Amino acid sequence: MEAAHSKSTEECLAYFGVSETTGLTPDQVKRHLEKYGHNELPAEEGKSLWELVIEQFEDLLVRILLLAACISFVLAWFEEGEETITAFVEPFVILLILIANAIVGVWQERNAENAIEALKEYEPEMGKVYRADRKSVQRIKARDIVPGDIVEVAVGDKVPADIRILSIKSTTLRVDQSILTGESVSVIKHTEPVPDPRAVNQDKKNMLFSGTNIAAGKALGIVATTGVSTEIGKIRDQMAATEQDKTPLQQKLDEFGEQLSKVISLICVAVWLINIGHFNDPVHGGSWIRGAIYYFKIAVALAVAAIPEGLPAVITTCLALGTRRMAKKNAIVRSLPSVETLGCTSVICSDKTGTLTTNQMSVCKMFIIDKVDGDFCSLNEFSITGSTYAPEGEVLKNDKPIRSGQFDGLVELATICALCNDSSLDFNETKGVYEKVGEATETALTTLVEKMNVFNTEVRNLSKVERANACNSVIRQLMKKEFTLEFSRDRKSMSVYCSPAKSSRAAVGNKMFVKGAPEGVIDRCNYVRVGTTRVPMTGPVKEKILSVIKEWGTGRDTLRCLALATRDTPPKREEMVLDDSSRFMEYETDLTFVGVVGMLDPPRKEVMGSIQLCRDAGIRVIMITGDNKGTAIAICRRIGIFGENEEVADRAYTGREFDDLPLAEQREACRRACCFARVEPSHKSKIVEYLQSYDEITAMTGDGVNDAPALKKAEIGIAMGSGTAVAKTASEMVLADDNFSTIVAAVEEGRAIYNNMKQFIRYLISSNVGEVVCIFLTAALGLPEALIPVQLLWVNLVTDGLPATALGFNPPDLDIMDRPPRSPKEPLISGWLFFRYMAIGGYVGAATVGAAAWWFMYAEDGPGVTYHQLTHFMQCTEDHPHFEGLDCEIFEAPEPMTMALSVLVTIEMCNALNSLSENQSLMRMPPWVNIWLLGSICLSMSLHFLILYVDPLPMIFKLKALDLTQWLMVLKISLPVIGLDEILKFIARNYLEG
Ligand SMILES: Nc1ncnc2c1ncn2[C@@H]1O[C@H](COP(=O)(O)OP(=O)(O)CP(=O)(O)O)[C@H]2OC3(O[C@H]21)C([N+](=O)[O-])=CC(=[N+]([O-])O)C=C3[N+](=O)[O-]
Ligand SMILES: [K+]
Numbered sequence: 001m002e003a004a005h006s007k008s009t010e011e012c013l014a015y016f017g018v019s020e021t022t023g024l025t026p027d028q029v030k031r032h033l034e035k036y037g038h039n040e041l042p043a044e045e046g047k048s049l050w051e052l053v054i055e056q057f058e059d060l061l062v063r064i065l066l067l068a069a070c071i072s073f074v075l076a077w078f079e080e081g082e083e084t085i086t087a088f089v090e091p092f093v094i095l096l097i098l099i100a101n102a103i104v105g106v107w108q109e110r111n112a113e114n115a116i117e118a119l120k121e122y123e124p125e126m127g128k129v130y131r132a133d134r135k136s137v138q139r140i141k142a143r144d145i146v147p148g149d150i151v152e153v154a155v156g157d158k159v160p161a162d163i164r165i166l167s168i169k170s171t172t173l174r175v176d177q178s179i180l181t182g183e184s185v186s187v188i189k190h191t192e193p194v195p196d197p198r199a200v201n202q203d204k205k206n207m208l209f210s211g212t213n214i215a216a217g218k219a220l221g222i223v224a225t226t227g228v229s230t231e232i233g234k235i236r237d238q239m240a241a242t243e244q245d246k247t248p249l250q251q252k253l254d255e256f257g258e259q260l261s262k263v264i265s266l267i268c269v270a271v272w273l274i275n276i277g278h279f280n281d282p283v284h285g286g287s288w289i290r291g292a293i294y295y296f297k298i299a300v301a302l303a304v305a306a307i308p309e310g311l312p313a314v315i316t317t318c319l320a321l322g323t324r325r326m327a328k329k330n331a332i333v334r335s336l337p338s339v340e341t342l343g344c345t346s347v348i349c350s351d352k353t354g355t356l357t358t359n360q361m362s363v364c365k366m367f368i369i370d371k372v373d374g375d376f377c378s379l380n381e382f383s384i385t386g387s388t389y390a391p392e393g394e395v396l397k398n399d400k401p402i403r404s405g406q407f408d409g410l411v412e413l414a415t416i417c418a419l420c421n422d423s424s425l426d427f428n429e430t431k432g433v434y435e436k437v438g439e440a441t442e443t444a445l446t447t448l449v450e451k452m453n454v455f456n457t458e459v460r461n462l463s464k465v466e467r468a469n470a471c472n473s474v475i476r477q478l479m480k481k482e483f484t485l486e487f488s489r490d491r492k493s494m495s496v497y498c499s500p501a502k503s504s505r506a507a508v509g510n511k512m513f514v515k516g517a518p519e520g521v522i523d524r525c526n527y528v529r530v531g532t533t534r535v536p537m538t539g540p541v542k543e544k545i546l547s548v549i550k551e552w553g554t555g556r557d558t559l560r561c562l563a564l565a566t567r568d569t570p571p572k573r574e575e576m577v578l579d580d581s582s583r584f585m586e587y588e589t590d591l592t593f594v595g596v597v598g599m600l601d602p603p604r605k606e607v608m609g610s611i612q613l614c615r616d617a618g619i620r621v622i623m624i625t626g627d628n629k630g631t632a633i634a635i636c637r638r639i640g641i642f643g644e645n646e647e648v649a650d651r652a653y654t655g656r657e658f659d660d661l662p663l664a665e666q667r668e669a670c671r672r673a674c675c676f677a678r679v680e681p682s683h684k685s686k687i688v689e690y691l692q693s694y695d696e697i698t699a700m701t702g703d704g705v706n707d708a709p710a711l712k713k714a715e716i717g718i719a720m721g722s723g724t725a726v727a728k729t730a731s732e733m734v735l736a737d738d739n740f741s742t743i744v745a746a747v748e749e750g751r752a753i754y755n756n757m758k759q760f761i762r763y764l765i766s767s768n769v770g771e772v773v774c775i776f777l778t779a780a781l782g783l784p785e786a787l788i789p790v791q792l793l794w795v796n797l798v799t800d801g802l803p804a805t806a807l808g809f810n811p812p813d814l815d816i817m818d819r820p821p822r823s824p825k826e827p828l829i830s831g832w833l834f835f836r837y838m839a840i841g842g843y844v845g846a847a848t849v850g851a852a853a854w855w856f857m858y859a860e861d862g863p864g865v866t867y868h869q870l871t872h873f874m875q876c877t878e879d880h881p882h883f884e885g886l887d888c889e890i891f892e893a894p895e896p897m898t899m900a901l902s903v904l905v906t907i908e909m910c911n912a913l914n915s916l917s918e919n920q921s922l923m924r925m926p927p928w929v930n931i932w933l934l935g936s937i938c939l940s941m942s943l944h945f946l947i948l949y950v951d952p953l954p955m956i957f958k959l960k961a962l963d964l965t966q967w968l969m970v971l972k973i974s975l976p977v978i979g980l981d982e983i984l985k986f987i988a989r990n991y992l993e994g
């Protein structure tokens with residue numbers, strides 16, 4: 001039954017056909033279960049199935065490397081008639097890397113969700129119904145509640161379904177709806193229909209919503225909606241329809257691959273076309289394969305040589321360590337490339353209740369009467385530190401710690417807060433936090449008493465369980481609560497009747513403690529207490545009170561105020577009737593004013609500073625709450641979204657205000673406004689969608705069910721640890737300790753990750769360029785091969801593979817978060833940076849062939865051949881006239897190849913130092929800054945000196961120990977690459993941009 005809110009109670013009972021007193025007949029229950037089903041959502045699919053491994057292979061970089069692994073495998077398997085390993089090793093080790101690259105991927109999010117599921121422990125939901133089976137109320141399974149079921153709820157009960165209220169057994173019924181509507185205060189329910197057409201759940205005050213909590217009172221209702229049809233279920237399907245693209249980092253790596261897939265196709269056809277004349281016609285050789293496609297085969301192999309091969313591992317490595325860093329900061333991350341997405345965020349959309357605030361009422365201000373000199377009235381005002389239900393906090397007077405006990409007025413103020421209270425404080429030892437029992441407004445008073453400690457009770461050696469109501473149990477030993485006068489709307493206050501206990505100080509008679517709305521309570525006061533003494537209510541005194549209450553009610557410190565009073569001479573209890581609550585206001589007269597407490601749903605202490613750090617980084621914060629506008633504006637002014645006296649007007653919109661604007665004017669209002677209040681869960685995603693329409697990477701921070709669709713819509717969703725389950729599943733990042741200052745740390749991380757990522761990409765791609773140039777120059781000049789694929793394989797994975805990993809530990813700049821977020825359209829690799837590594841890449845290729853050629857001609861240790869003999873080494877034969885005094889085996893010597901390899905590994909160690917910064921000289925920013933890099937240089941160089949002197953390795957890498965003087969030549973070739981990059985860096989500093 002949809003829209004049950006807009007229909008009368010008797011109209012709802014007719015829809016299912018069930019008496020209010022009897023209940024559902026088992027015949028009806030059986031029919032109502034086949035026409036509506038079980039009250040539950042589809043099974044939780046937070047299980048990482050083994051089909052989600054293909055998601056790790058959606059990255060085309062891995063796919064390119066996978067494709068390059070397959071086209072490097074086939075040409076060596078069916079050709080050349082050689083089953084050696086040299087051509088076979090690279091095919092499977094690439095495949096061995098990729099399968100291992102996918103391991104960490106499906107293990108990270110698996111380890112993540114196992115920590116997210118740990119956040120909420122199993123507490124099976126139940127429900128209380130009335131049926132024709134038994135007259136007594138029977139507690140049944142929550143899932144077995146059908147629409148049309150007569151359901152009663154009491155204080156503390158979690159509403160099992162979307163229920164239309166029928167009758168409120170108590171005077172008033174308060175319902176906490178923070179997790180669904182973001183409403184900071186509990187709502188009072190009625191039974192009358194709401195004929196509002198465009199009504200939000202917040203306007204539907206005649207129904208109970210599933211998932212919400214009952215604050216106070218009890219009522220009996222009719223279930224109008226169950227299962228996925230409920231307001232929670234509607235959102236579950238709402239986010240199920242919500243679709244998001246790949247993470248900004250993941251899609252930025254993809255476009256780099258599309259650029260690398262082009263040069264892979266470019267050099268594949270370039271080598272194929274330059275050898276024209278030989279191709280496009282069958283020549284002497286290769287008749288088994290028509291067309292002589294031999295030139296195509298060597299072109300494909302050369303294209304594969306351009307792939308950094310080791311790169312898809314060094315990237316995942318960098319993200320992996322950056323993830324556990326956040327884990328140290330109690331931040332759980334779903335996907336690996338989601339650790340960067342917060343580093344390129346332009347707008348952070350945050351929810352209010354539960355996210356920006358603790359969602360726990362806290363008494364922060366509090367005053368009593370100090371002196372009454374007829375015309376002069378002074379007050380004793382106090383401040384209370386805290387922001388949670390925890391008994392942790394001290395009472396201050398004029399920002400100085402005081403003992404509440406030495407104030408007689410405060411002792412009585414506590415006595416009222418402890419006795420006139422139907423709520424308690426409990427310590428959830430499972431979650432390790434303090435939770436409320438009943439109404440938040442009263443629990444705040446309970447917390448206040450525990451913090452005050454008016455009798456100075458030692459509580460040091462008490463467990464957190466019995467600490468929750470320690471100071472309150474001391475007060476409750478003094479007076480005996482005879483009965484309580486429940487809250488009523490016409491009066492807006494409540495009171496309790498108390499008689500002394502244990503005959504202690506029986507000189508005084510019974511008392512009556514009252515609390516309620518200030519103006520209403522004070523109007524019924526005739527006396528004000530000054531410590532222990534009482535004086536009449538004078539005009540000036542009356543004014544001094546109301547002036548402060550009005551001040552605390554608005555402005556700088558907008559609070560929820562509450563006046564506290566006692567009735568020194570209460571009526572005899574036999575002359576009081578507790579049947580009609582309209583008599584209660586009269587009983588609460590001739591009162592004595594004691595004091596007033598100020599409370600609010602306070603912002604988290606880390607929120608204000610975090611917002612400023614985001615602003616300094618150029619990240620605009622925007623509040624999106626379902627709470628009323630007044631509270632929203634007030635919170636914004638405290639955290640720094642708005643100024644103390646800043647004129648908001650159309651920088652803040654409500655649900656209706658925003659829904660009345662045309663679509664064109666709606667998206668333009670999302671770049672101006674920074675506060676949207678009284679907002680449906682639908683609008684939250686729409687605001688995110690609008691910000692994304694201007695190509696802005698926007699984040700979302702929430703905790704409630706109404707935040708779920710927006711948490712999923714954003715590029716990155718951030719869920720609070722003390723939030724709903726659906727919010728946790730809809731997000732990628734989960735703050736485990738609700739620390740808001742973790743976000744700004746995840747921004748610095750994401751900016752440090754991306755910057756370092758550009759570095760070891762440029763570092764690895766430059767090496768492969770040199771290799772391609774080397775292989776090409778060899779085939780161009782007809783020289784002996786300088787580098788064999790087995791050597792380059794070892795290099796790109798080990799020797800310059802892990803120094804690239806050490807580049808992921810480059811120190812963050814000081815100007816890392818004083819600059820705006822990077823541009824979305826801005827590419828990972830630019831045309832300038834392309835030329836930059838292509839220039840040093842070209843040098844590497846020319847240096848490698850030059851090193852080997854040096855050994856053949858001008859090296860004293862070498863044969864000293866001429867250039868013609870070197871370029872015609874294949875025409876060499878025994879006793880060849882043009883090769884006099886030379887063995888043709890000298891062109892297969894391992895010594896010149898060692899030169900080409902030692903010049904390659906050394907030129908990368910120098911390039912590693914240049915890869916420290918992008919535009920900073922080594923003279924300005926010294927190379928001894930990164931100690932992680934230097935360690936990688938030594939280890940890789942250690943292996944290089946290990947790969948020459950060990951003896952078995954030179955026999956498989958075709959190498960030999962280098963000469964003591966020949967090493968000096970290597971340094972005279974490798975070192976200039978520093979000066980090359982230093983030149984490129986020089987015309988970058990204030991010459992490329994200045
Ligand atoms: N309009 C109203 N309708 C119903 N109750 C009201 C009320 N206005 C105040 N109260 C009751 O007045 C107090 C101050 O209002 P506050 O928080 O400053 O709001 P204001 O700005 O002054 C008025 P606004 O809505 O036009 O903006 C409130 O405390 C309790 O009920 C409230 C309460 N509770 O959970 O909220 C619980 C409770 N018990 O016992 O559980 C008792 C209250 N009480 O007053 O006794
Ligand atoms: K997300």
Ligand SMILES: [Mg+2]
Binds near residue numbers: 090304305309792793
């Ligand atoms: Mg290779």
Ligand SMILES: [Mg+2]
Binds near residue numbers: 351353355704707
């Ligand atoms: Mg919230």
Ligand SMILES: [Mg+2]
């Ligand atoms: Mg108000």
